[PDB]
Amino acid sequence: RFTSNIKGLTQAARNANDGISVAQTTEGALSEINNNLQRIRELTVQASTG
Amino acid sequence: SEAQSRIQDADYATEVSNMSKAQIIQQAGNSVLAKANQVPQQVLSLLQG
């Protein structure tokens, strides 16, 4: 039983690491999308002048 | 690259420990094998010849 448990926890730890990696990838994508949106807001503030 | 490295690239810290364990088991097994092979001749000691 202890062997089964330790193997299961090891595999679970690897799965959690994989999830952390996918979350990191998503966060990077969202960060650069944020940069693009900030630049668009920059342009919009520029364009309001008559 | 970070994600793929998390699956590949075996952790050396555990690898060295497993290697040392395997070496110790190998040495102990060989020694006990020799000691077991040193047992039978007690029958010759019994036979007194």
Side-chain angles (χ1 to χ4, degrees), chain A residues 10-46:
Chain A
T10 304
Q11 208 82 356
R14 322 173 39 80
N15 291 339
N17 277 331
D18 189 358
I20 297 169
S21 49
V22 76
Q24 256 181 298
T25 305
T26 61
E27 184 176 2
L30 277 296
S31 174
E32 186 64 27
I33 301 171
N34 188 359
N35 189 359
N36 265 334
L37 280 174
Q38 286 292 321
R39 177 53 176 198
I40 296 172
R41 170 161 158 64
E42 171 66 19
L43 290 176
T44 296
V45 176
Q46 185 178 119

Side-chain angles (χ1 to χ4, degrees), chain B residues 15-33:
Chain B
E15 288 298 329
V16 294
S17 290
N18 292 118
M19 201 275 278
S20 174
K21 195 204 212 286
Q23 258 178 218
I24 297 299
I25 297 304
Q26 173 69 343
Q27 301 212 41
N30 287 107
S31 300
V32 71
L33 167 57

